[model samples]
Target chain A: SSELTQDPAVSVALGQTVRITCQGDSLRGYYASWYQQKPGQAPVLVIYGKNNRPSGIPDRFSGSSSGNTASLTITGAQAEDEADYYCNSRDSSGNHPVVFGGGTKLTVLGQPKGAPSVTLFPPSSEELQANKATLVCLISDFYPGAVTVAWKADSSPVKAGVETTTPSKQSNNKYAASSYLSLTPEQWKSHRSYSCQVTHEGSTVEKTVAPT
Target chain B: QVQLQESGPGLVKPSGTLSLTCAVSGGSISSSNWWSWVRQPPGKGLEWIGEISHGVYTNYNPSLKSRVTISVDKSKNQFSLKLSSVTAADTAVYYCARAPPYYYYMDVWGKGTTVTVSGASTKGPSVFPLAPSSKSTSGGTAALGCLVKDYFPEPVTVSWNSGALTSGVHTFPAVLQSSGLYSLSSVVTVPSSSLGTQTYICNVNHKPSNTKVDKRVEPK
Candidate 1:
């Protein structure tokens, strides 16, 4: 059996250096990896094969290993760099290729501010058929990137056919994510009102529209 | 209705084993729901460690399948995860989760507990909205477009109708927004023959919030 974990749960600011270490037994003679994650989203790999930096990763991220311990380091972290960091390890004994460490939470330290600009765009009914259609909720231009999306019909919750996307890092150092709902064209024509509600910073913002 | 909490050592020496247990409350471990061990390092995202639905089904991330074991204790109403040969890199905030049958998503989550191998982990800030522009193309037929854009945490639904008539509708697959959001365009067709003094209505539905938008066309 192989295991992994990280240290130091904290809140830090932008432009700082982060160096987190991962430990394990029987970890010698093996490769390790590091990952970064935001809340409500899946983790993405930053360091792989112990020290190899995958494409699309910034150069500020690096990894190393000494005997049974592995380490990940990030220099000059940005607001976008803020997130949880995890380490993964495996042995050459041909077993447990991946064991994950607990994560390190990093705060960007107040850079991007305020709620994102959100909009709900309904699917049109010009060529609707097969008793089905799709709706999209758009959110953007927000910093620190944690948001919630909701759907309702006449103020009632719509749970089925709902799928949400990951919050992606924007060039401006903010975060973004989206949600969707599917329904019949007939269902669309019948409802007097439909709403897209987005929750940011404890405030509820929404847009409701009806087809004529 | 069972609740889950993850427990493990706060720190591990280099090359030492790391282990954790998920204590279940309010429900039985023998229940049908699949219980899983998930984790995220400080400032990182999430990782699906492994899961079990009694002896009925068990799955693990292929990346770590060989060395990982997710076990259930019916009498204790608990489950556990054991990872060996762990190092400082294994540190993270471990969580226990429940996944319903056949669904790839985790709907319920533990509050999360941190394991320290050594490093700094932090938190994030909060972030919303745009108005969708609507239109319909007309000729012998009309194509209605509800363009949603540049939004966060998404995948909204779109639908259509002709004032309670079951009209033929085709929704375009959502397109990604360059501003790091998503957009979906749906079109419901209306032949001029289908038109009378009647009007066409476009409806957009957002889930979880159940928000709705209806755009009307008087057929001008």
Candidate 2:
């Protein structure tokens, strides 16, 4: 009823490493937070409260505690490790209602057989003739088999060459892939250099599109 | 040192309508604290959808209290959340918490910034739904289904397996949006069968720690 329970609840693979313990009993001081919602991307607070650090979050995510039990470690784990992992606290009592624990569903089993399926796109722009403008990198639910989509440019690596299309299986079977690249419009006004790399097996996932 | 950032327009276009904004950089929006807007609907769970107070004072989550609308400016310190029609389940991943200036519960949080409700050519490995078949079945009627993606508005709980399970006749289902994220399904129709293989977690207790179960189902 208090919230915060994680003990081998669910964890498959990716790199292994999994430990989500956030028991609860004391609210005396209050301060514990951890979040990671990965399926479509967007819930990444990693750790803050027991350990603290919400600015950028990426040390591999770490936090520890003892008395009331409090831990949030995710060392290796990859394949986006699926998603859904939560732990929250905070109640010096100003109003009361920031308690969330129920969450831990990371499933990232084996990978190497064919791997290379990652898609995430939705930020388009185009207008290249020379006036400078091309920004068009669209990715979507990729699991196509043997895949590869590159264009780091700023993080290095930018050969560029992928058109493997064939993703449209929804009902729960899972399968959707798409890729595109053109960026030039002055690299889309230089918001963050260019990044859309997507390699499989060996692992390499990147997505950074910023313009309008 | 106080901080919070969550600008808007990541992508929204189902029934249409979902504005966002949560500036507040070094603190001082008016002090006193208490500002929130949590959301996560790509995988599911975490849906508090409400909270704001600079003196204006407000609180939501009555199932979204009819559409939701939190606002605050305090001279651009920033604070906002619209939510109107929105389909695709209101596609989520929108956060902006600072409800611990003095003490509220949400104790600082904000690293989320996704917003996909549909439209504008939405795409991204979307395919969720089909994990509620059976596990123990037949209590009163044996109705079990609990899946709340991640942490959005926050505050979630559905206990069972013998312990904590509250909410009237047991009917917590009310978060559906197919291709746009945000999903919720809670059902416990037990009248007989004495509930056995029982297991229906979905916690998120809040405050100083403890309770964050997220999802668990075993009611075949």
Candidate 3:
């Protein structure tokens, strides 16, 4: 039985360093690697070999080994680094085989925290003539990098014509996101109060505008 | 169908060794797949001990590489594990399974069995080896202990003697082991100045053995 185990979890302030360890029995002669995984996405390889960084990995990420333990290190942490890390290795009992460590979740502490600034842009007449309007809900200045976008017409939930991107982190450790609502001019011309609502960390901000 | 079963002693002394056998049936040992042993701690995840392919090949976790060995016997279709210098950290539930990938085929998993590095096993006070961290009163003195385990009626006497002196001895009654057997652990304190080359003895008098079997003291 060849098994691997990763450290439980670790939390560090932004721009700090973190080291994760993966331990196993009889892992000798096996190549070690690591992967980063977000909530519901495929794992992305970060490092491999004794100390080799793969393409697309930042210089701050590295892989190393000591004795029988494999290590993954992250220097200068960022909000985007707050994810789960797993150690991987191939231990062929006879043929091609691989084993994975459980995983370690990293949290970037002191993350920027605030309500996202909200701005709504109504469609123009030229755009309305085509019977379509792309309403833009530009949300920015949020911290901790998680936000929700929703559309509302007269306080009822609008499920259709909705597309929202997850909060994206900026260089200043802040977050930004956008959602687009497409509507027909006839629907837009209707007497209704339209609002683009952004929610973050217990605070909700709504940009409401009346279309007459 | 390859059926697996694991059997081993529940207790092991720290710094001592651990041995277990995984019996296989309903399948031939000379088959293509390897025999594997895996274990998990009480609340921790799994760890693959190592795997062996019918005298063809073997692989072990790097951390346990030098301390673990896997072997097989084709005639009996069984594989064995020998893990050395075990500690409480090695205590876990062990399982034997058909080496994976070769799995996905018909197979039977051994209902896991627990192994512990506890001194509670039913065995007479034979004065076992001492691990560095065992009962260490270190820096000045330490508690030297021995287990008197699993003898009917437990009619035994304990005595401790330094190279020339005899003092600081403690005694207790028989303890009921999980197996319904009884055990006793006795301790004697020795000062750091009493270390090196000087022999200490833990003497046990048992009616069953009918002999005053005494063992040398072991401490960190």
- Best-fitting candidate, scored by TM-score: 1
| Model 3 CAPRI rating | incorrect
DockQ of each: 0.04, 0.05, 0.01
**Interface RMSD (one decimal) of model 1:** 12.5
Report the alpha-carbon TM-score of model 1 versus the true structure.
Answer: 0.41
Off by over 4 Å in 2: A1-19, A23-36, A41-81, A89-107, A111-212, B1-36, B39-220
iRMS for model 2? Answer: 16.0
Chain B alone vs. reference chain B, TM-score for every model: 0.50, 0.29, 0.53
- lDDT-based ranking: 3, 1, 2
Classified by CAPRI criteria, candidate 1 counts as incorrect
- Of 1 and 2, the candidate ranking higher by DockQ: 2
Best by DockQ: 2
For residues B60-86, could you state the per-residue lDDT of candidate 1 as single tens digits?
777666667788878787888877666
- What would the per-residue lDDT of candidate 1 be over residues A1-212, giving only the tens digit for each residue? 23665674756557777788888874575556676766544456687664677578899999888877888888887777877787755434443333556667766676857687554555544334334455666566666567888889878998776777666665455776657766788777789878888888888878776656
- lDDT of each residue in B21-83, candidate 2, tens digit only: 888888776677778888866545676677877748777766566888888887887888898
Q: Isolated chain A: TM-score per model? A: 0.59, 0.32, 0.61
Model 1: residues with Cα > 4 Å off, grouped in runs:
A7-11, A28-59, A62-67, A83-107, A126-135, A144-173, A177-199, A202-206, B1-220
